[PDB]
Symmetry: C2
Subunit: 436 residues, 2 copies
Amino acid sequence: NFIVLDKYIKAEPTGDSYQSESDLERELIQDLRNQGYEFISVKSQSAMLANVREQLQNLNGVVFNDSEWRRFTEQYLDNPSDGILDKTRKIHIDYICDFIFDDERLENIYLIDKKNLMRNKVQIIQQFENRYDVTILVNGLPLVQIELKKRGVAIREAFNQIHSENSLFKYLQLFVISNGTDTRYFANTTKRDKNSFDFTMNWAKSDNTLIKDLKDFTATCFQKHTLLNVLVNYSVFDSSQTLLVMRPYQIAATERILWKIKSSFTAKNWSKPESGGYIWHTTGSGKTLTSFKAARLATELDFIDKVFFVVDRKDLDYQTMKEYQRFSPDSVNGSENTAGLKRNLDKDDNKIIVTTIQKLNNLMKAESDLPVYNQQVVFIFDECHRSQFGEAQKNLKKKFKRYYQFGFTGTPIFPENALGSETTASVFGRELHSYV
Amino acid sequence: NFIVLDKYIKAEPTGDSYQSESDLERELIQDLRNQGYEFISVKSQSAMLANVREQLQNLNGVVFNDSEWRRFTEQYLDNPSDGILDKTRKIHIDYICDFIFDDERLENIYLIDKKNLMRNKVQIIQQFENRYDVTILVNGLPLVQIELKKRGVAIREAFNQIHSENSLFKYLQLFVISNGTDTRYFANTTKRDKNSFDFTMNWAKSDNTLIKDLKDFTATCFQKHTLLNVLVNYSVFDSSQTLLVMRPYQIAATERILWKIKSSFTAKNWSKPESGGYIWHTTGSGKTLTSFKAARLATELDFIDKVFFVVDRKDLDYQTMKEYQRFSPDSVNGSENTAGLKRNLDKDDNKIIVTTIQKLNNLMKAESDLPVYNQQVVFIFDECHRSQFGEAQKNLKKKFKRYYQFGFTGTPIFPENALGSETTASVFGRELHSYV
């Protein structure tokens, strides 16, 4: 089911005292091969590229000769004129090459299969030819680089010590830094003070249970679906350009939201006060980012037709829209009126719509039985049922039925701070995932 | 010394009855390895390209990695978008790639070393994956394709029977067709009636001794310097486009001319009536082509400074010039006057000058001790000492001294036809090479 775990797995030390740099390598290879991986031997650079033209065969089902592989190698996969940024863009944005065969038919060669990601074959290798390196290599390309240390190299100086040929090691998205007792991970940002252990991430369980050691970290995160979802569906290549990786509580809340959608659609549920739910992530979050990944994975999920991330305007429809235009390509304005918002409800393929609740009430109190009624519609609020039970919501319970009404709160109106509005007892029902 | 032989070598049958297609293959491989060749085994297509990045190393003295070899393989040597014509042009015209290293220095990668051609390493391979094929493969590239037959396949139908992958076999310049008794050779022209055995060539000795069998043909022509000179210095890629290969008597006459130059320069000879010489090739020759190769190999020979291929104009300075512009790049007009011809004697790097004898007499009877006197100058006449002993020639014996005065005749004035002028007794001295 989920990605961020709910059950605390068994974590035991298997020493192998962690003042070494090879025993934890062997233990890590043992645990990954227990998790059904494949260890091959490439003490070279070209044979690694020979692995790609065989592992990609199973993923695409078509046969290269050597002559097509010349073109595919030098024009698309292994351009010498490219660094880390465009190659990361090739990982996350342009991951398909529209390749022309010598038989002259255009076929789409993938790199990472993103729809049905079980086909994406993983392998494990280690260092060859600096320090000691283990590499989880996905579909021929090296993606995750586990870098190991000792206790004398503390976690702050672990990053601070060290930050063609080879050019193939510019596909590395992550750098899982660990020593034997603490384990942190991050993406390609290499500053000294700011990109220290504060910007890196403690992987954790659902609520607050942080993970430090290796064996528990390997048992949790390095599953196939888990680590491939962390690589693919939960990382944003911002057009700064900067790769941004979600926090684990963000991923957990997004998974609870999307599984609530998935479990509610299969049991024909809509317009129920228990069909909703709400999240409390207060601040220091990038709630823009969590809401964006929730809405973006909702849009492709094919059960629905419209997603309304909708707030109350006090310079928010200019602000958060500017956030979602930062995550460059696509989000449709609810700007500027209730004439053209209907045009946005006519349009598709860019299904995330960011409007204000006031334009929605101006649409819903009039305009005579809109034709976007029967479609499956997901609301993502801000100032949710833990902040309001507003007149717009009872207008909504009057008009709409096939809606999944979710929301976010910054400070929830609990019974402990019930001075403003009610609690959540008949609007969103249960709380889903929180952070404090 | 020479290329076309003067001594009849021993030709003996070593049967191995020639109703087979494998015994003459074995005999041919035995004879070529007796002539100091190398037989490797490539039952593939890619490993043949692996031979190139090792044999070219000795020829250029520099080291590729795999990444430079990607660029050199796909951009220059093995373009998929090229056929036979541009690849033949790469053999004979653009045989150097100005390659940029990954260390960023421009160095000139050769294909065939043309100045000191002993470095050009040859190998021999046979067929793999049609009929039976033996291939002499020069410096990694396959150049000569010996194709073998039997007696039941007659020499006329031998060509007439059969006229990516592989693309490497488009470097083939020749097709030495033989059966076991007769042996013929030609270049890339594949018509039925016209490009039959008439346009192909009987290799021969100096005067008239034709060669038919294999063992004598292998003992004569498949020497390293002999076959590499036939490939390199005695083939013209005409801008028709058509590759033209010289006749053996043409090559023999050119070699006698150039060795007479080489033996006369080393013994400080000039202005002697025995320092000259003359050729009788009557017609059906392309005397334009023989004279062009004589003058062109004279110009690069570095002993001389000026070459005057000079005739008497009856629409010849427009005709033969049009022939030498057909052999596209470079030949300087003696057109149109004795004012600008002096400009042509000032200019260099295009040392072949085609003027008329009348403009020369207009230059030599006046203009007061020209400054192009002391340079080493080779005259190539037409209507030679076997056709005239003209007043221009005694003006020349008055003025010039450092000249090598050669000439051609169509019908020689022998003593047998001495009605017109004298013989050659004090002008060019000895006859050099003839054909009838």
